Write a protein that binds this ligand. Structure first.
Ligand code: A1AJ2
Ligand code: CL
Ligand code: CL
Ligand code: CL
Length: 163
């Protein structure tokens, strides 16, 4: 565990993280994909061996000794708001199980279902709150990665609000 488990946010490419493991915003088929998934494929391509897994689950594959946790959020183009919300919460619960099993002291995590799987909606609050629900009972240092300057400010404010 980290000696004082914390949440932080960084605005940078998650492929350049400084944590002991990474969560991929994966597709169910283990394909290279686009966005976070393509950057993860370029950095850790070995981790895509038998990485395919259903929506709402996470599957870890080692790149050397570095763990890549493939977490499959729902595509809100295809899911109803209600079923989508359930699967998005479940994907994060499976990430917390993996992070705990691996015994890491830190994890780099993107906001699942906020990019091409968002169904064209702003899902910052929805995705972040499901992230907190899952990860609050873990003792890893969590570092959330984002691209957008306004998202960095909103994520920082939400972390600081809890103190
Ligand atoms: C931290 N997030 C990201 N990491 C890598 C590539 C990305 C491409 C598009 C959007 C976000 C990206
Ligand atoms: Cl960067
Ligand atoms: Cl996405
Ligand atoms: Cl972003």
């Amino acid at each position: 565990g980290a000696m004082a488990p914390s949440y932080r946010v960084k605005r940078m490419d998650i492929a350049k993280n400084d944590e002991e493991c990474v969560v991929n915003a994966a597709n169910p088929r283990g394909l290279p994909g686009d966005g976070v998934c393509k950057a993860v494929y370029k950095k850790w391509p070995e981790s895509f061996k038998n990485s395919a897994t259903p929506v709402g689950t996470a599957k870890t594959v080692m790149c050397g000794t570095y763990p890549v946790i493939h977490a499959v959020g729902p595509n809100f183009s295809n899911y109803t708001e209600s079923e989508g919300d359930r699967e998005l919460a479940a994907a994060y619960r499976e990430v917390a199980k993996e992070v705990t099993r691996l015994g890491v002291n830190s994890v780099a995590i993107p906001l699942l279902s906020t990019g091409v799987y968002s169904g064209g909606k702003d899902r910052l609050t929805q995705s972040l709150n499901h992230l907190f629900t899952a990860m609050d009972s873990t003792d890893a240092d969590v570092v959330i990665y984002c691209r957008d300057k306004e998202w960095e400010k909103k994520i920082s404010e939400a972390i600081q609000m809890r103190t």
